[PDB]
Design a protein around this ligand. Structure first.
Ligand SMILES: Nc1ncnc2c1ncn2[C@@H]1O[C@H](COP(=O)(O)OP(=O)(O)O)[C@@H](O)[C@H]1O
Ligand SMILES: Nc1ncnc2c1ncn2[C@@H]1O[C@H](COP(=O)(O)OP(=O)(O)O)[C@@H](O)[C@H]1O
Ligand SMILES: Nc1ncnc2c1ncn2[C@@H]1O[C@H](COP(=O)(O)OP(=O)(O)O)[C@@H](O)[C@H]1O
Ligand SMILES: [Mg+2]
Ligand SMILES: [Mg+2]
Ligand SMILES: [Mg+2]
Lengths: 516, 516, 516, 47
């Protein structure tokens, strides 16, 4: 009378704390597990507003569930980071982390101290990163045949039926276009546009951008070839001074002198824009209705109040400078595009700026029969852009289908031999955890994981094939590299590192104190 | 349209049902785990009425918690059965069952099918039973030394402090004395009485019984040596007919003639009791106040309305025959006892019938300073009576301290080699599960289970020493047989068979359907 | 204006009624599906009282999940009758039923009228009963080797591990023993007692009965060899006239004269029982406290107030006659037993009447480690007893493993060829339905049902192994009759007829009117 | 598992829909019928 710590709190100590964290992780892991690989299935998620999401995407599934459990939230972070650093393998990272917790339980139930488990996992993770470097194969950032296999593998992971060669080719062309002068890929430089239509095969790559604006005046050309584009962020209105300034009029005559003076400078603004040679204009602010007319007379296509995000993208695509002062508009600020057309797409009117030659931003136009069908294709397209860009930046790949994990697993066991004592148990555990991937690939495929795993493990033993993996379609062990089943080194290195760091952090916890 | 199964129910399928049972099992095992062994600790259980139990007794703890979880209830049954068939090792049984469930989870996580683990478990258990037979030593039903070591070990299992030589010797004598013609032991022939007093060391064995009664008339002797005892099933009251009868009196004088005839029937009943040579009498029913005087006038001690259970044991102890008709009574129906005394014990007035020559029932009078202190001594005396009972009936024992489980474990692994493919994993898991006993023993002793196992395991290898186990005290591996740490074969055979059958039953479950 | 049909009613018409019924049926079928065959898994059913049921038994499951849906109730009835008429194959009957509903929906969805579906179903069923007759093998009522296979097969269906050669032989001996002169086998004559113990292998057959009672006086022998058993349904007390009667006493001396005449009436009742030759007495009503004495002084074992249920079974076993009047008790009315002994079992004392010569009632004493494990063995025994009885009664059997179903289905397609009209679609559908069994057996075994069905069909085509079926244990198509996997003809004929009649009934419904 | 069409709705099919409309139609006709012609009568409507 009374208590020290609040009366309004739950608390779980020792083995109870370890259990609830481990359990929470394992359950999260098991939620996305059934989505892994080609034979994986999809979730349909519905929120409280009744909006639905149908996806095979690990991190998407995890964000869309209202997971409130604290240890679970920690594992979701593993996915969010995989999405951010790589753009693919979010399910893998989560499932590996889950396996690491499970494997840790069996050591904690022998009374191996948690710090020792932690020590072992840390040692194993580091060795794994060293091993991954020797396992990876080098590739050039210009190796299109290879980049296209990277994209194919990625799209396949979301079901073989989406893995179009056309689609993969488009994607490779798109990432290639936006590679910068330092060799980095910014995935935002690829505008993604989603428009219902006849078929998914209608998805196309636009050398330029799509703007959701109609041209300001119908008297303007709907179409213009080899255009000279002008980007303004200043308003084409009568300029007012920043200082408070009022006009005073005493002479009835001078009433029209001020009106005329205003419209004479508008006519002078347009005159200035025409003078620079531009026949197409995108303005961020507004355009006085009279200037609209004046622009139209000269046959200049103009669109108004274009959002910042679009402006910045337009400049990137045509090589134009977003100019802030009309007077300062010279003809070297004009971008250049093959075709600029106002056109309808799925009943929506939009301005297409396309057929640019050396564009620094491009647009994936994704097509499909229905919103939710399109939505998942886009998610697939996002994965593929991720891993293609990773490959272009790193120039390292590994074979897929569980082959890299098995090789890695097999090398870590060898490593475990030379570890003295109890830490060794943890290192074996870490090694064995990695096989959750090849096992999960086979389960989802309906095959028998135990025997499959013996077969693959055998094709890896003593100078075998590091590329040996199960082929879920034929049911055999094959050279996954010779089959074009490949993925960026970054997917494995990030996923393992994330898995190791988050589980190590959870495994150090011996006390949970929750309020409310 | 409505549902088929009632919408008023929770259902758990596949992995979920499996985790539900397996988890509920383990948790139930983990609650009793800290009681195991001489260095185990006690629970204090408080119910809804505020009544309290403090015990180290496995099945008592499990019974006294009001467990609702269906899987948990299935394991509690294992404890209940161990109590009934053996009377000791309830905690061992359950902790082994829990471990079998845990070891089974590792198998199910690898996609070993439930029916296979069940198969392997069943094989391993059958083999364990066969090994247990070769492992056991033969002893004689009358080997006081070994029996005494059996009792001592049982009582140590509830703390070395309770294990006084005096107490084990009392118990061995108690059980020995109630063994019947066929060499069987009826726990119920040994009456337990609990009375507070100076000390637990005051606990004594009575070659007789304690009857919760006072002699009916204070005029009667309260001490009788070399007593001749009569046991009556009929009441010493006026006898009436079953056929409805009634007296008609028309003659004033005929009053006293009836009163005096009823008064004479009594004097006759007593006079018949006298003739048999009896001087002490126990009547299951009532004695007419008037007959009480006549008995008193004759110097015959008598108690009225004796609990039939008391009559049944008085008979067992003294050699008397419970007689249902006074006329049939004869000196041959009389029992014998060296001392019948009415005296007070901790303030309660009772009759001791003691110093009987060859009693077929006896009384453990358990003493202690306080009610709850006594209760636990009692529970400890029950475990001991149980195992001495088993040793007398079976004449087979095993060494303890985890030695036998380790030996089994070591040997079942040798067996598992001959098993082909996949069942093998289960068999090896069963072997591994038994090591939970030596592991738990040592962790409760504050020792390091992992290295202790390595040491004990070594002492068993290369045709070593089946009796080797950890001494929770010295902290070293010793010969438990030389240390007198021994237990009935039936303790292990029941425990393991119980744990095997119930987990097998639970492992076959893939759907849980719960109502309300 | 005020509404005709009540306003509380729910109504489903046409398509909606058909789908409601057809769905409810399939759902019920699906909940027992996972239990079918040797690789079947069990369900755990909890009720609103916390009471638990773990079983593989189809009808037991369906009965215990308190199902409300009307269409589903109709299908439970199929299981209940399989149980009454046969004792095994309750899951098979329900699963076939569900399948017939399913195949009916594919026909309904092509606008085949329900009456036509009904008509085709009836024809296919009738033809199946004629095919089944030619498919069965003749068998001897006393061919133990075959009966034992029949029993072995029944027990395996509830899991391999319960399939003991020993258990099967016991069961055959038990059924064989109660077969009456006409050759009919009444399940009720085989009493089932359940008592915890060392293990399931401790299950024994008693040629006789167990009585839940103790002898009335300890003075009576606790064990008698080659016993003469009297069974008296009247009470061994003083007889009272049915006409109201009362004694008048007027002479103080003629007081004892009545007591003494009642004491002589008991003594005589006993003397007459002894003159029968009887040394064991089971009485249905009470036994006067005093007569209990005279019985012991004559060395007669006597048990009082034995329930009418047991008297009847005692008489059936020993060859005795329940006598209503001690007077007319002759040496011919006594039954004979090799051994009558009162002993303890699971710590409960009972009277064993065993080693009878020609028992027409017997006892399966079932043993297991825990209550809930025993329960399941008991059902396994119930099933085996059923089908052993069916074989003895019928003399016709078929091969298991879904083999008879495949034959039946292949032949029925031959029959369908020569049928014209939409009717043909319903018959061919009835044929296809049967294959739900082989399919479900394979699926539960983790096998691939489609190709396995392809192989089994092939082994049946063009004369032709009717006994060919999939061995879940090897994964190969084998000769089930040479593998010993056999079952009574009545299992299939009852199941199929049940499934056909109830679904035909359901298919005729176009309107459901539920109230409240 | 839940319903497709919202459980918060009444539905009338086949003959029932037909009787519903046909009846609601006739009743509406029958309320104004007594006004028809020179010998028709008036309504008093109160809101
Ligand atoms: N053709 C293939 N055969 C076998 N495995 C494949 C194939 N294509 C992709 N995979 C594997 O599927 C996994 C990725 O599957 P996916 O469902 O996209 O999960 P994640 O969200 O973790 O990327 C990787 O392990 C990859 O090796
Ligand atoms: N002196 C001892 N040294 C080591 N182990 C012992 C000793 N005495 C008893 N044990 C072990 O303790 C275990 C039983 O402990 P106990 O707490 O009574 O549990 P249970 O309820 O299962 O009998 C057995 O393995 C027994 O061999
Ligand atoms: N050894 C076996 N191999 C293959 N099938 C078997 C074997 N034993 C039994 N069966 C099949 O199992 C089915 C019985 O399943 P069961 O679980 O008993 O449910 P039920 O008898 O209640 O329908 C029958 O089709 C029988 O042919
Ligand atoms: Mg992927
Ligand atoms: Mg003990
Ligand atoms: Mg069956």
């Amino acid at each position: 009378q009374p208590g020290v710590l609040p009366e309004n709190m739950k608390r779980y100590m020792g083995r109870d704390a370890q259990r609830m964290n481990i359990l929470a992780g394992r359950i999260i892991a098991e939620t996305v597990r059934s989505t892994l690989g080609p034979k994986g299935m999809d979730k349909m998620l519905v929120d409280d507003l009744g909006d639905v999401v149908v996806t095979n995407d690990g991190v998407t599934i995890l964000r869309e569930m209202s997971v409130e459990h604290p240890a679970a939230k920690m594992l979701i972070e593993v996915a969010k980071t995989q999405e951010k650093e790589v753009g693919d393998g979010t399910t893998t990272a989560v499932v590996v982390a889950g396996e690491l917790l499970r494997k840790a339980e069996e050591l904690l139930d022998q009374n191996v101290h948690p710090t020792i488990v932690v020590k072992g996992y840390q040692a194993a993770a580091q060795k794994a990163q060293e091993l991954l470097k020797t396992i990876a194969c080098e590739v050039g950032a210009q190796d299109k045949e290879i980049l296209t296999k990277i994209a194919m593998t990625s799209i396949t992971g979301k079901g073989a039926e989406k893995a179009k060669e056309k689609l993969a080719e488009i994607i490779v062309e798109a990432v290639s276009a936006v590679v910068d002068d330092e060799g980095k890929v910014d995935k935002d430089l690829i505008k993604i546009e989603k428009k219902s239509g006849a078929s998914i095969d209608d998805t196309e790559l636009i050398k330029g951008v799509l703007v959701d604006k109609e041209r300001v005046s119908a008297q303007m050309p709907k179409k213009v070839t080899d255009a000279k584009i002008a980007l303004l962020n200043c308003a084409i209105e009568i300029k007012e001074t920043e200082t408070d300034a009022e006009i005073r009029i005493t002479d009835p005559a001078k009433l029209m002198e001020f009106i005329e003076q205003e419209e004479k400078m508008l006519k002078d603004m347009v005159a200035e824009i025409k003078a620079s040679g531009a026949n197409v204009l995108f303005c961020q602010k507004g355009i006085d209705d009279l200037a609209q007319h004046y622009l139209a007379k000269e046959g200049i296509v103009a669109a108004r109040r274009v959002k910042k995000s679009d402006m910045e993208k337009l400049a990137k695509a045509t090589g134009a400078n977003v100019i802030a002062a009309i007077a300062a508009l010279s003809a070297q600020d004009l971008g250049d595009a093959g075709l600029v057309e106002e056109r309808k797409i799925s009943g929506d009117s939009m301005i297409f700026v396309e057929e640019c030659k050396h564009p620094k931003a491009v647009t994936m136009l994704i097509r499909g029969t229905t919103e939710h069908v399109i939505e998942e294709v886009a998610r697939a397209v996002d994965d593929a852009v991720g891993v293609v860009g990773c490959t272009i930046e790193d120039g390292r790949i590994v074979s897929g289908g569980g082959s890299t994990e098995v090789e890695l697993s097999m090398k870590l066991r060898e490593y475990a031999e030379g570890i003295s004592g109890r830490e060794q148990l943890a290192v074996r555990a870490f090694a064995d955890a990695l096989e959750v991937i090849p096992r999960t690939l086979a389960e989802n495929a309906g095959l028998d994981a135990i025997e499959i795993l013996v077969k693959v493990r055998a094709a890896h033993a003593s100078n075998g094939n590091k590329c040996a993996g199960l082929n879920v379609f034929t049911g055999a062990v094959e050279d996954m590299c010779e089959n074009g089943v490949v993925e960026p080194l970054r997917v494995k290195t990030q996923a393992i590192q994330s898995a190791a760091e988050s589980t190590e952090m959870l495994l150090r916890i011996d006390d949970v104190i929750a309020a409310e």
